[PDB]
Amino acid sequence: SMKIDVVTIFPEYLQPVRLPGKAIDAGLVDVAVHDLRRWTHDVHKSVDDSPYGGGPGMVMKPTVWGDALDEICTSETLLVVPTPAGYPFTQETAWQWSTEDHLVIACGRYEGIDQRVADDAATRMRVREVSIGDYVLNGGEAAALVIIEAVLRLVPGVSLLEGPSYTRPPSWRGMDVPPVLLSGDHAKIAAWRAEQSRQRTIERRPDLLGFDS
Amino acid sequence: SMKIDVVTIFPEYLQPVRQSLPGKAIDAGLVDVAVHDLRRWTHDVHKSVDDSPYGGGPGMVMKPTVWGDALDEICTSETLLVVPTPAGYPFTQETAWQWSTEDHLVIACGRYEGIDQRVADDAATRMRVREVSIGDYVLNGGEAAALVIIEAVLRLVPGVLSLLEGPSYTRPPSWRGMDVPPVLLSGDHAKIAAWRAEQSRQRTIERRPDLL
Numbered sequence: 001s002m003k004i005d006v007v008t009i010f011p012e013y014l015q016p017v018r019l020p021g022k023a024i025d026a027g028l029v030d031v032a033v034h035d036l037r038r039w040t041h042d043v044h045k046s047v048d049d050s051p052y053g054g055g056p057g058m059v060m061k062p063t064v065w066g067d068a069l070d071e072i073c074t075s076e077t078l079l080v081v082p083t084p085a086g087y088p089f090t091q092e093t094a095w096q097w098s099t100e101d102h103l104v105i106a107c108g109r110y111e112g113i114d115q116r117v118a119d120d121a122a123t124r125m126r127v128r129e130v131s132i133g134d135y136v137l138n139g140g141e142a143a144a145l146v147i148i149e150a151v152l153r154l155v156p157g158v159s160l161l162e163g164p165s166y167t168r169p170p171s172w173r174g175m176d177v178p179p180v181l182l183s184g185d186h187a188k189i190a191a192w193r194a195e196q197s198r199q200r201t202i203e204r205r206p207d208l209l210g211f212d213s
Numbered sequence: 214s215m216k217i218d219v220v221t222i223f224p225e226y227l228q229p230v231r232q233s234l235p236g237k238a239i240d241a242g243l244v245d246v247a248v249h250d251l252r253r254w255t256h257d258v259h260k261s262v263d264d265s266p267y268g269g270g271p272g273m274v275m276k277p278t279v280w281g282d283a284l285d286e287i288c289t290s291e292t293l294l295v296v297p298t299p300a301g302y303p304f305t306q307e308t309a310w311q312w313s314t315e316d317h318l319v320i321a322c323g324r325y326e327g328i329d330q331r332v333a334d335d336a337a338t339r340m341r342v343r344e345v346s347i348g349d350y351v352l353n354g355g356e357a358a359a360l361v362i363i364e365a366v367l368r369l370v371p372g373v374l375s376l377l378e379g380p381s382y383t384r385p386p387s388w389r390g391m392d393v394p395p396v397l398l399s400g401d402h403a404k405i406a407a408w409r410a411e412q413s414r415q416r417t418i419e420r421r422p423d424l425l
C-alpha cells in the first residue's frame with residue numbers, strides 16, 4: 001500500500017495518472033493531486049516573486065509551500081522535488097522508492113522553488129531533489145508523471161540493452177524474422193539475443209559497458 | 214511551424230499536451246499537435262495490437278501489420294519518426310534543439326515489450342527514424358516519454374513559449390529561522406556572480422560529478 005500526493009499550480013496536467021490507472025483500480029496505490037493555490041490567502045493568489053540578487057524570471061515563495069507541506073506531510077514522508085539541479089533518478093532509485101508508504105511530489109514552475117522550503121522540510125522528514133535527465137523542461141509536472149510510472153510498476157502487487165523483438169507473420173513486406181528465432185533451439189536463441197544486445201549496447205550506450213561517450 | 218502527430222493505444226494520456234498549448238501560438242499557426250488511437254488501424258473485430266514473441270519469452274510484441282498501416286497513412290518522406298524506447302540512443306538537450314526546427318514529428322508510442330523491429334527498419338528506408346531513451350529507468354510504455362519530448366522540443370520553438378544551477382531565494386528575507394544569504398542583498402554584483410559560481414561548483418561536485 002502506497003500513498004502519493006502531488007502538489008502543483010497545474011493540477012489538470014496530472015490527469016494522465018488516470019498503468020498507474022490500473023494500479024489505483026486494484027486498490028494498491030492511491031494518488032491525489034492538490035492545487036498549490038489552495039494555500040494562498042491574498043486576492044490574487046500569488047505564489048511567486050522576483051529573485052534576491054537579481055536574474056531573469058521568478059521564484060516560488062516559501063510561505064505558500066510551507067503551509068501546503070505542513071498539512072500534507074508527516075515525519076515518515078519521503079519528499080520528492082523534481083529539479084534540473086537534482087541527483088539523478090535511476091532504476092535503482094525507482095526500486096528504492098517502491099517500498100515507501102508515502103511519497104509527496106512538489107512540482108515547481110518559473111525558475112524554481114525558494115531553497116529554504118527543502119531546507120526546512122529536511123529538519124522534519126527525508127528530502128530528495130532529483131533530475132530525470134539532461135534536457136530542459138518548463139516545470140516539474142512531466143517529471144512527476146515519469147517518476148510515478150517508474151515507481152508504481154515495481155510495487156509488490158503490480159545493465160545491458162534489450163535487443164530487437166519480432167512477432168507474426170514470419171515474412172512481412174519482404175523482410176524475414178531471423179531464422180534462428182523460428183528454430184526452437186533455446187541455446188542458439190539465447191546466444192543470438194546476447195550478441196544482438198551486445199551490438200546494440202556498444203552502438204547506442206557505450207557508457208553502460210565502460211567506454212567513452 | 215511544426216506539426217506533431219502522436220500514435221498510442223492510450224490517446225487520453227496525451228490530453229494535457231493539447232491543453233498546454235497557448236491559444237496565440239495555435240491561432241498564429243505556429244504549432245499543431247494531433248493524437249491518434251492506434252486501434253483505428255487494426256484488422257480484426259477484436260482490435261488486436263499485440264501477439265506472442267518469436268523465440269519465446271515474457272510479455273507481448275506489437276504487431277507489424279497494424280503499425281505499418283498507421284505510419285503509411287500519417288508519415289511522408291519529410292517526417293522525422295521518433296520511437297521512445299529504453300533501448301534507444303539518449304535524448305539530450307542537443308537532441309531537443311535539433312528537432313525544434315523540424316516541420317513534422319511523428320511519435321510512435323509502444324507498450325508491452327516493444328514494436329516488431331521490422332516496422333522501424335522498413336520506415337528507415339524512406340524517412341529519418343530515431344529510437345531514443347529519456348533516461349536510465351524503465352517505464353511500461355512510451356506515453357510519458359512522449360510528453361517529456363514534446364515539452365522539451367516545443368519550448369524551444371520561437372513563439373510557443375556544464376554546471377548545475379545553485380539555490381534561489383525570494384521574499385521574505387527571513388523565514389522559519391532561515392535568512393537569505395546576505396551577499397545577495399549587498400548590491401555588489403560582481404561579488405554576487407562569484408558567490409553563485411562557487412555555489413554551482415560545489416553543487417555539481419556533490420550531485421553530478423559525471424559533469425566534471
Ligand SMILES: COC(=O)c1cc2cc(CO)sc2[nH]1
Nearest residue numbers: 083108109112131132133139
Ligand atoms: C521548477 O521545476 C522545473 O522547472 C523543472 C525542470 C526540470 C527538468 C527535469 C529533467 O530532469 S526535472 C525538472 N523540474
